[PDB]
Amino acid sequence: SAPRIMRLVAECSRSRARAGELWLPHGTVATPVFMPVGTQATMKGITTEQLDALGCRICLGNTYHLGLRPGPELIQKANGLHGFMNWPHNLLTDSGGFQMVSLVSLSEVTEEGVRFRSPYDGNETLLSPEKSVQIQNALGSDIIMQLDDVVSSTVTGPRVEEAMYRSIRWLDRCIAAHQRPDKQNLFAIIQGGLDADLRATCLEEMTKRDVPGFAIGGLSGGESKSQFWRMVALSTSRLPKDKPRYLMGVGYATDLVVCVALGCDMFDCVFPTRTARFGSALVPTGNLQLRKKVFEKDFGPIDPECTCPTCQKHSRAFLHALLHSDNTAALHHLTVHNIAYQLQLMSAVRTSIVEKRFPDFVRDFMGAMYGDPTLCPTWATDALASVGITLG
Ligand SMILES: Nc1nc2[nH]cc(CN[C@H]3C=C[C@H](O)[C@@H]3O)c2c(=O)[nH]1
Ligand SMILES: [Br-]
Ligand SMILES: [Br-]
Ligand SMILES: [Cl-]
Ligand SMILES: [Cl-]
Ligand SMILES: [K+]
Ligand SMILES: [Zn+2]
């Protein structure tokens, strides 16, 4: 009944890979899409303008870092979070509850919401589904995330089932609190941890609600890669095909390609930024460790196929010297490049899907990444074989 925000351009015959279009209030976004953090909280980070120049048409943004106390913040801006960020394209804004429960061990979770006491004076801050959705309505982001009860995937016990059912109840609360469904798209977040039955229950129950899209939560928490890819495959097997699948917290290139093969459409991770901080640059063969002296007299670019400004203007040797003379500017250049590599990777994946050659693409990618596609990690081989893709 409700209008679908996603159009399927193509689906490959073997895997679950999909190429599509998100039609959002600030423009169309090609999927599968990696979503960089547009929030400027980092002193060392790429700017919104450079993201626009790279071709990024949707990024992540929250106001958790602003203000006086921890939690999401109203900004009291006439143009909302888009005006605050000077961003003409699409924004995805999480609830802020994940950061509130992860960054502060003092914060506690009750059915009423996420509770915190002031570090300075013990002031009590409560983030309820109602408050989360009201803040997100004021911010005006294009896609807003349900407030959910997040538990560590390493945790086992009744707490997992408790959080799953609480996430369902909070999904209903957020749906009810959500004004402006004509301008913002609320996504549910599938919970259940590594328990197949709990996650299957969460799938069956959450897909009963007519929300524009669905996300897969509680993965990439230190769980085994077997459990990770099995949970992803379960989720996408039971999520509707005419709506987006957003897998939160995965940025490794191999994980991206594999989870595209499993049916995921949207991704996010701060991995490119962290990789840059080690003096490392992402390439089809993995990463170049530019601090090493084998690049001292290497005057080629990071990647002669890369279209990013760093590869247009600077060489490996310049970056190698800059890492040891001005680590910060080198970090900025490597950040630009790694984000451009993530975008270039997603674009090439989508192109391979549209041209009906995705399995050959995966084979080439694994060969370049690991030497020969049969040297691919065992978990990725299992995952790919589960949806009809064999290597070599
Ligand atoms: N709102 C929300 N934001 C998120 N970002 C990343 C996740 C990924 N799941 C995290 C939660 C527990 C697991 O150990 C993993 O570390 C996520 C979520 O599950 N919910
Ligand atoms: Br990023
Ligand atoms: Br040079
Ligand atoms: Cl809704
Ligand atoms: Cl060396
Ligand atoms: K805050
Ligand atoms: Zn580059």
Residue numbers in the entry: 12 to 403
Sentences from the study reporting this entry:
In contrast to the homodimeric architecture of the bacterial and archeal TGT, the eukaryotic, heterodimeric TGT is composed of a catalytically active queuine tRNA-ribosyltransferase subunit 1 (QTRT1) and a catalytically inactive QTRT2 subunit. Here we report the first crystal structure of the human QTRT1, which is the catalytic subunit of a eukaryotic TGT enzyme. Analysis of the human QTRT1 catalytic subunit reveals the enzyme to possess a bended (α/β) barrel, consisting of an eight stranded β-barrel at the core and eight flanking helices. In addition, the protein contains a Zn2+ binding domain, in which the zinc ion is coordinated by a triangular arrangement of three cysteine residues Cys317, Cys319, and Cys322, while the α-helix bound His248 completes the tetragonal coordination of the metal ion.
Furthermore, we were able to obtain the structure of human QTRT1 in complex with queuine. Therefore, we chose to soak the ligand into apo crystals. In addition, the excess electron density map localizes at the site which is equivalent to the preQ1 binding site in the bacterial TGT enzyme. The 7-deaza-guanine moiety is stacking between Phe109 and Met 259 side chains which have previously been implicated in queuine binding in eukaryotic TGTs. Furthermore, correct positioning of the queuine base for the enzymatic reaction is largely provided through polar contacts formed with Asp159. The exocyclic oxygen forms contacts with the polypeptide mainchain at residue Gly229, thus completing the coordination of the 7-deaza-purine.
